[PDB]
Design an enzyme around this catalytic site. Structure first.
Site, PDB file in Angstrom:
ATOM      1  N   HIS A 506       1.253  -1.254   0.034  1.00 25.63           N
ATOM      2  CA  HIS A 506      -0.063  -0.069  -0.156  1.00 25.63           C
ATOM      3  C   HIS A 506       1.182   1.090   0.061  1.00 25.63           C
ATOM      4  O   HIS A 506       0.360   2.240   0.841  1.00 25.63           O
ATOM      5  CB  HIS A 506      -1.078  -0.262   1.719  1.00 25.63           C
ATOM      6  CG  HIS A 506      -1.928  -0.679   1.599  1.00 25.63           C
ATOM      7  ND1 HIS A 506      -2.790  -0.926   2.183  1.00 25.63           N
ATOM      8  CD2 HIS A 506      -2.638  -2.086   0.606  1.00 25.63           C
ATOM      9  CE1 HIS A 506      -3.559  -2.236   2.083  1.00 25.63           C
ATOM     10  NE2 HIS A 506      -3.523  -2.188   0.614  1.00 25.63           N
ATOM     11  N   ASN A 551      -7.267   0.521   2.758  1.00 28.52           N
ATOM     12  CA  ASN A 551      -7.080   0.065   1.089  1.00 28.52           C
ATOM     13  C   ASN A 551      -6.885   1.126   0.072  1.00 28.52           C
ATOM     14  O   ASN A 551      -8.155   1.874  -0.224  1.00 28.52           O
ATOM     15  CB  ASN A 551      -7.506  -1.031   0.637  1.00 28.52           C
ATOM     16  CG  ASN A 551      -7.553  -2.115   1.789  1.00 28.52           C
ATOM     17  OD1 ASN A 551      -8.807  -1.468   2.399  1.00 28.52           O
ATOM     18  ND2 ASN A 551      -7.666  -3.092   0.994  1.00 28.52           N
TER      19      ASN A 551
HETATM   20  C1  LIG Z   1      -0.522  -7.577  -4.566  1.00 34.13           C
HETATM   21  C2  LIG Z   1      -1.991  -7.229  -3.849  1.00 34.13           C
HETATM   22  C3  LIG Z   1      -2.639  -6.349  -4.124  1.00 34.13           C
HETATM   23  C4  LIG Z   1      -3.051  -5.520  -3.168  1.00 34.13           C
HETATM   24  C5  LIG Z   1      -4.327  -6.042  -2.390  1.00 34.13           C
HETATM   25  C6  LIG Z   1      -3.218  -8.029  -2.121  1.00 34.13           C
HETATM   26  C7  LIG Z   1      -2.496  -7.828  -3.405  1.00 34.13           C
HETATM   27  C8  LIG Z   1      -1.938  -9.381  -2.291  1.00 34.13           C
HETATM   28  N1  LIG Z   1      -5.473  -6.258  -2.186  1.00 34.13           N
HETATM   29  C9  LIG Z   1      -6.310  -4.955  -2.527  1.00 34.13           C
HETATM   30  C10 LIG Z   1      -7.245  -4.009  -1.561  1.00 34.13           C
HETATM   31  O1  LIG Z   1      -8.091  -6.048  -1.439  1.00 34.13           O
HETATM   32  N2  LIG Z   1      -7.169  -2.959  -1.430  1.00 34.13           N
HETATM   33  C11 LIG Z   1      -6.889  -2.340  -2.721  1.00 34.13           C
HETATM   34  O2  LIG Z   1      -7.182  -1.178  -2.520  1.00 34.13           O
HETATM   35  N3  LIG Z   1      -5.406  -2.797  -2.750  1.00 34.13           N
HETATM   36  C12 LIG Z   1      -5.341  -4.423  -2.904  1.00 34.13           C
HETATM   37  N4  LIG Z   1      -3.678  -4.129  -3.129  1.00 34.13           N
HETATM   38  C13 LIG Z   1      -3.011  -3.773  -4.139  1.00 34.13           C
HETATM   39  C14 LIG Z   1      -3.851  -3.138  -5.753  1.00 34.13           C
HETATM   40  O3  LIG Z   1      -3.266  -4.119  -6.606  1.00 34.13           O
HETATM   41  C15 LIG Z   1      -3.546  -2.006  -5.839  1.00 34.13           C
HETATM   42  O4  LIG Z   1      -2.910  -0.706  -5.705  1.00 34.13           O
HETATM   43  C16 LIG Z   1      -3.089  -1.480  -7.125  1.00 34.13           C
HETATM   44  O5  LIG Z   1      -2.741  -2.506  -8.410  1.00 34.13           O
HETATM   45  C17 LIG Z   1      -3.104   0.035  -8.335  1.00 34.13           C
HETATM   46  O6  LIG Z   1      -2.868  -0.182  -9.360  1.00 34.13           O
HETATM   47  P1  LIG Z   1      -2.406   0.704 -10.446  1.00 34.13           P
HETATM   48  O7  LIG Z   1      -1.719   2.155 -10.492  1.00 34.13           O
HETATM   49  O8  LIG Z   1      -2.663  -0.122 -11.877  1.00 34.13           O
HETATM   50  O9  LIG Z   1      -0.598   0.039 -10.576  1.00 34.13           O
HETATM   51  P2  LIG Z   1      -0.345  -2.090 -10.736  1.00 34.13           P
HETATM   52  O10 LIG Z   1       0.846  -2.243 -10.076  1.00 34.13           O
HETATM   53  O11 LIG Z   1      -1.917  -2.666 -10.960  1.00 34.13           O
HETATM   54  O12 LIG Z   1      -0.030  -1.703 -12.438  1.00 34.13           O
HETATM   55  C18 LIG Z   1       0.578  -1.315 -12.788  1.00 34.13           C
HETATM   56  C19 LIG Z   1       1.389  -1.911 -14.111  1.00 34.13           C
HETATM   57  O13 LIG Z   1       2.139  -1.358 -15.394  1.00 34.13           O
HETATM   58  C20 LIG Z   1       3.279  -2.253 -15.055  1.00 34.13           C
HETATM   59  N5  LIG Z   1       4.715  -1.738 -15.660  1.00 34.13           N
HETATM   60  C21 LIG Z   1       5.669  -1.386 -14.537  1.00 34.13           C
HETATM   61  N6  LIG Z   1       6.486  -0.214 -15.149  1.00 34.13           N
HETATM   62  C22 LIG Z   1       5.685  -1.002 -16.111  1.00 34.13           C
HETATM   63  C23 LIG Z   1       7.118  -0.081 -17.406  1.00 34.13           C
HETATM   64  N7  LIG Z   1       8.008   0.447 -17.375  1.00 34.13           N
HETATM   65  N8  LIG Z   1       6.447   0.177 -18.835  1.00 34.13           N
HETATM   66  C24 LIG Z   1       5.432  -0.539 -18.895  1.00 34.13           C
HETATM   67  N9  LIG Z   1       4.338  -1.063 -18.595  1.00 34.13           N
HETATM   68  C25 LIG Z   1       5.018  -1.651 -16.906  1.00 34.13           C
HETATM   69  C26 LIG Z   1       2.841  -3.302 -14.333  1.00 34.13           C
HETATM   70  O14 LIG Z   1       3.371  -3.963 -15.353  1.00 34.13           O
HETATM   71  C27 LIG Z   1       1.704  -3.899 -14.034  1.00 34.13           C
HETATM   72  O15 LIG Z   1       0.457  -4.168 -14.516  1.00 34.13           O
HETATM   73  O1  LIG Z   2      -1.157  -8.797   2.961  1.00 31.53           O
HETATM   74  C1  LIG Z   2      -1.386  -7.499   2.805  1.00 31.53           C
HETATM   75  C2  LIG Z   2      -2.902  -7.710   1.849  1.00 31.53           C
HETATM   76  O2  LIG Z   2      -4.449  -7.976   2.494  1.00 31.53           O
HETATM   77  C3  LIG Z   2      -5.419  -8.095   2.354  1.00 31.53           C
HETATM   78  O3  LIG Z   2      -6.023  -8.737   3.359  1.00 31.53           O
HETATM   79  C4  LIG Z   2      -5.412  -6.661   1.868  1.00 31.53           C
HETATM   80  F1  LIG Z   2      -7.145  -6.033   1.694  1.00 31.53           F
HETATM   81  C5  LIG Z   2      -4.402  -5.668   0.859  1.00 31.53           C
HETATM   82  O4  LIG Z   2      -5.271  -4.400   1.700  1.00 31.53           O
HETATM   83  C6  LIG Z   2      -3.201  -5.530   1.251  1.00 31.53           C
HETATM   84  O5  LIG Z   2      -2.705  -5.307  -0.117  1.00 31.53           O
END
Ligand SMILES: *Cc1cc2c(cc1C)nc1c(=O)[nH]c(=O)nc-1n2C[C@H](O)[C@H](O)[C@H](O)COP(=O)(O)OP(=O)(O)OCC1O[C@@H](n2cnc3c(N)ncnc32)[C@H](O)[C@@H]1O
Ligand SMILES: OC[C@H]1O[C@@H](O)[C@H](F)[C@@H](O)[C@@H]1O
Ligand SMILES: *Cc1cc2c(cc1C)nc1c(=O)[nH]c(=O)nc-1n2C[C@H](O)[C@H](O)[C@H](O)COP(=O)(O)OP(=O)(O)OC[C@H]1O[C@@H](n2cnc3c(N)ncnc32)[C@H](O)[C@@H]1O
Ligand SMILES: OC[C@H]1O[C@@H](O)[C@H](F)[C@@H](O)[C@@H]1O
Ligand SMILES: OC[C@H]1O[C@@H](O)[C@H](F)[C@@H](O)[C@@H]1O
Lengths: 577, 574, 52, 104
Positions: A506, A551
């Protein structure tokens, strides 16, 4: 692949998809690059948990998560192995090996911080929890008009909720959910509210939930297509976005520099509008690799020309976690309306209740599930159905309990001896603390070391700030000990602990939002526009400047909708030609 | 709708029948209980991402996350430090999916199944060796050269379907370093070569590993590329039973359960092929009235296929890792002249190209030179992008085990992460197990699994006699051989792995010439005895003790089976 | 246990294990300083760690 | 059954037990410090031959016990340390501290 698009979006996560949905839908010619690949079925960017097989074997999903979490900064390893054979090659020093980051102070790290590279980002595995921030966690979008600020955030959250299909009723009939909800509600009556964790999810049947993702937000199909003949969108996976080119004046981005990982060629791409939604770490990387902020160890005697705030004031939440084993009292109350005659197995076991009796503690739908379970499974010592869904409980962040809470079941990998415990008894507890944004808390990039994609290696300089942040962190822990005791005792091997810093994933404020660049120590305005640049926009949790416990993704999402509204008014779609 | 052929399972053996029978003009339907999971190329290897090959240790997690244990015995671990308020049962009751039928001491606890489109070929290590004769079922009796000729015909076609090759790691320094040291140590006693791998290198840092997609792309047909072909794949469909006619001479339909809609149907075809894995073929068959449901009971022999589920074989697997000897590491740079000291403006590392004193070829010295000059901070001479070792000495009478000296996806203990991975080499030696009647896979008449099918139970021990002596001898030989490359890595010491973890189970529905005499379920056409139109494909067909990775052999048998099919069933007109 | 209870290690190097799950209120080190009887003279890679 | 094979180690000048001039032990005496590696050459090579040998021999009695797989033990656990004040005929020539009457 064309020279030139109306809008290029770097990143195919849920935030990049928000811009695509808005801008594609408004008739713009859009290109989206992702460094990662399509690997989630025919629904592009969808939740990997939406398979029959994963919701029938739900703890296996923990390996899908672990499989696509690549650590951001691993310090150099100093473990001593001194039982090698004397003939084996043995180190004289703790040299830089296996991708470790010699820049990294192991004691000032977010060692749990991790990144995901697949089409859809982390929305292909996330937990789908989407709470709103209350004012005290929320960035201002209107100064000096709290009413207008509230209305602008409501508008925005409401639209995001619908893009995510957020709801609060998909586990309404879980026995375990209500068991815990009711106990806690009673326990804190007049002190705290409990409700279902809001979750981006649609329930399709009693055993299956369609978890939302980037694909929910935008389906990532190439357009024009039969279902959308007049829209234009193209997705290019396996394309490392490396730099945006600044004009000499620092007022406009002139191209986007890419690297097709499959051919190996580098290309420049033109667009009117450039949107960076690469995630909190990789948005900053790309920006720094582009000349914003300061490449290298930070050096206050050398302030950078552009965005001196980039990669400073970063936040990451404290996360405390345990599991409980449901109390005997509560398990027993599950069947408190039951009349039980005979002994389980013998031909005269009867389990019965009276539908609609006033003295019933539980509703009918609950008692009927209990009775059927008990009658069909007499060898089973428990009253909870096998297919009962998981609890999904929270009391949201408040000033007297300034942490987010989740009292639920998340995919988990069980140790030997915990598998000994019937999983119906187990409840996870995660409390999430808010972290004050401090200038000394940095994400920076090394000017020598490079990552797997030959970009400057991220390096954290982070500590949980003394003061409120630390006090609250420790208070939060105690509050989890105290609240959790009311449902059950701790599960051995899942005892109350702080989780590795950043494992929570986060991270915010790496490229933070504010009204004024210098006065609010920020990098983007409330339209998420990079200061000084007509056409450079950032979306993501990096934009969040505040100390928050909930979150963040819903909030990032709401900011990107606002951003899109500025883009719609100040740039024009090319004619559909 | 009516098909010419239905195939159960979308793994590489079902895709064999697809590619053979789609290409020959049949109207084919294929059903998988799993879903499309590998991007746009359906059923493709999951490790074919740029991100996995840059982060290859991560891949372990993909594998673990689609390996669902077959039979977990009831758990009797004592947790006696719960809080006194917490609910605790007074017995080790049946919980968490565990199988009350399972003897924890006669199990293959590492046995597991994968329910995704492309089956286990979306994660396998792609090792495709031929069986030599000692390991190999006879396809012609009393004419060894004819048998040989048939097996080579079939293996050769199978290798073109999987794209097997032995050339993809030819320019690896670690591979050549390990390959030449073993070639020398065993000069005149054993031969070493590259592990034959189903894969095509696309660049110096990317291997396109093969899969079921390689054998058949699983796209619906007809399509622009194959407008005269007919294929439909249906994922998320549990196939549950084949229905026998009263005479037990023909299958009359296939009962399926579409897991999305929830509907249950009876699919009709002319030919029914089961390629659902050595476990699940056996399950569907038993659920259809073949063999015997329930705890085996001899005094009540089954109508059909009395050998089903019996004579099962699983390999013994030993494993360790080694950390490369000082000697070999230095030998990487034996042709180097080393001036000055790393890091200073003076340091030179040079060689002379084509010099006859040179121990290594120009291409190798060049790579070493550049790595040594460009990374003067690095104490080792192997380049960072240098592909993994892939070495084998194939099964032979004097060493009757298959061997892999190589690197698989591995989850490192972080004490083990202290060791630089260029130094680490995996050792896996694979034993052959005698087919014995008492070693069995059977299905509960009471307990059911996550899909409501009769629950799989193993009653298995590694037979006494040669199976056990070889397994011990095999472990000794790994200790002796590995020692020549370097000493064991702490935390990866020589061990037997968990029975069945190896995933090379066969003989569950074993092939032979004669049902009774050869105690078997299908003939050399993989046709189920008695039945006109039912075929089994897969490792379950292999009736012998075998050390080498069984899949290619399974594929060869499948190809022959399709020859019978083509000679005996008319495609419907299109 | 009798044995282990009268083997006192001859030379234990300074300990560089990262403990990064302390509560943020707990006193935390900035460096791997000389703690709990350890020998800062000792190269952990050229020891007889088991000597006691 | 336990199996322990113990190897011989070539005496090498560079393998040292020395004492700090600032750091003291629990009894306020100079803190012992080791500078030690198993010498390359025969010692190393015999070390690994000794391991292979234990593997070959033990297999004759039974297979290894899980949890107690063949391994090198922590350098020095064996408590067989010698040569720290070593005997010889001549101080200089035999690089030594006591003669064959153990007299300094
Ligand atoms: C891993 C995790 C994430 C969680 C979570 C549980 C887990 C185990 N559950 C969540 C929830 O319950 N509540 C919530 O708000 N957050 C949770 N999260 C986090 C959430 O998953 C992230 O906050 C969210 O994706 C952020 O969205 P985003 O801003 O779109 O960023 P994301 O990383 O998803 O997508 C970005 C991407 O772009 C790529 N990338 C990276 N570098 C480059 C470059 N240089 N060029 C082109 N693309 C690039 C990636 O490959 C990626 O898809
Ligand atoms: O383990 C950390 C994660 O766990 C879950 O319970 C969440 F909802 C997320 O916000 C976070 O990514
Ligand atoms: C997992 C794995 C396997 C493996 C390996 C290493 C790993 C960790 N590497 C190997 C190697 O190096 N080479 C060797 O030859 N084998 C190796 N393996 C084993 C190999 O993957 C398997 O032998 C091969 O995949 C077997 O192929 P087959 O096509 O017979 O079976 P499958 O891959 O299991 O796919 C079968 C499928 O049918 C499905 N299914 C199961 N039940 C049903 C029902 N009832 N209805 C409909 N479909 C069903 C599956 O979901 C599956 O796709
Ligand atoms: O983990 C067991 C697996 O490991 C590999 O190294 C082999 F190639 C496989 O045949 C096998 O299935
Ligand atoms: O732990 C090492 C010790 O173990 C025993 O086996 C020996 F008798 C000793 O020589 C030695 O000191």
């Amino acid at each position: 692949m064309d020279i030139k698009y109306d809008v290029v979006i770097v990143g195919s996560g849920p935030i990049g998809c928000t811009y695509a949905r808005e801008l594609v839908g408004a008739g713009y010619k859009v290109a989206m690059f992702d460094i990662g690949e399509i690997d989630s079925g025919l629904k592009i960017g969808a939740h990997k948990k939406n398979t029959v097989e994963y919701q029938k074997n739900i703890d296996k999903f923990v390996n899908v998560i672990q499989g696509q979490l690549m650590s951001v900064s691993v310090p150099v390893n100093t473990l001593v192995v001194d039982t090698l054979s004397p003939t084996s090659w043995q180190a004289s020093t703790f040299f830089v090996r296996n991708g470790s980051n010699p820049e990294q102070d192991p004691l000032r790290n977010l060692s749990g911080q991790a990144v995901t590279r697949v089409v859809g980002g982390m929305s292909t595995h996330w937990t789908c929890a989407t709470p709103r921030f209350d004012r005290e966690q929320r960035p201002l979008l209107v100064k000096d008009d709290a009413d207008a600020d509230d209305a602008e955030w409501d508008r925005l959250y409401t639209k995001a909720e619908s893009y995510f299909q957020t709801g609060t009723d998909q586990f309404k009939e879980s026995i375990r959910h209500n068991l815990v909800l009711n106990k806690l509600t009673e326990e804190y009556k007049g002190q705290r509210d409990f409700q279902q964790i809001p979750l981006a999810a649609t329930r399709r049947s009693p055993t299956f939930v369609e978890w939302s993702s980037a694909n929910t937000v935008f389906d990532l199909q190439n357009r024009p297509n039969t279902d959308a003949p007049e829209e234009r969108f193209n997705l290019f996976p396996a394309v490392a976005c490396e730099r945006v080119v600044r004009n000499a004046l620092n007022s406009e981005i002139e191209s986007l520099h890419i690297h097709d990982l499959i051919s190996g060629d580098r290309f420049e791409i033109k667009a009117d509008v450039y949107v960076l939604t690469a995630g909190a770490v990789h948005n900053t990387q790309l920006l720094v690799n582009s000349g914003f902020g300061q490449l290298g160890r930070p050096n206050p005697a050398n302030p950078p020309e552009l965005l001196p705030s980039l990669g400073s004031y970063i936040t990451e939440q404290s996360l405390v976690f345990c599991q409980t084993v449901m109390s005997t009292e509560l398990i027993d109350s599950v069947k408190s309306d039951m009349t039980i005659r005979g002994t389980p197995g013998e031909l005269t076991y009867s389990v019965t209740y009276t539908p609609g009796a006033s003295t019933n503690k539980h509703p009918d739908w609950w008692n009927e599930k209990v009775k059927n379970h008990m009658m069909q499974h007499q060898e089973d010592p428990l009253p909870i159905p096998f297919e009962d869904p998981e609890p999904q409980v929270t009391t949201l962040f408040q000033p007297s309990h300034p942490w987010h809470t989740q009292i639920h079941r998340d995919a988990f990998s069980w140790g030997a001896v915990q598998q000994s415990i019937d999983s119906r008894l187990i409840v996870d507890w995660r409390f999430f603390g808010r972290t004050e944004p401090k200038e000394e808390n940095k994400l920076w990039f090394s000017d020598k070391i490079t990552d797997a994609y030959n970009m400057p290696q991220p390096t954290f300089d982070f500590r949980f700030p003394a003061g409120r942040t630390s006090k609250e962190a420790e208070d939060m822990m105690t509050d989890m000990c105290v609240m959790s005791a009311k449902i059950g005792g701790f599960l051995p091997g899942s005892l109350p602990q702080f989780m590795e810093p950043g494992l929570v994933l986060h991270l915010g404020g790496t490229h933070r939002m504010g009204f004024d660049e210098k006065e609010d120590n920020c990098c983007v305005n409330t339209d998420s526009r990079v200061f000084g640049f007509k056409n450079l926009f950032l979306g993501g949790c990096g934009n969040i400047p505040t100390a928050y416990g909930a979150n963040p993704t819903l909030t990032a999402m709401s900011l990107a909708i606002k951003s899109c509204e500025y883009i719609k008014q100040n740039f024009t779609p090319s004619p559909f030609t």
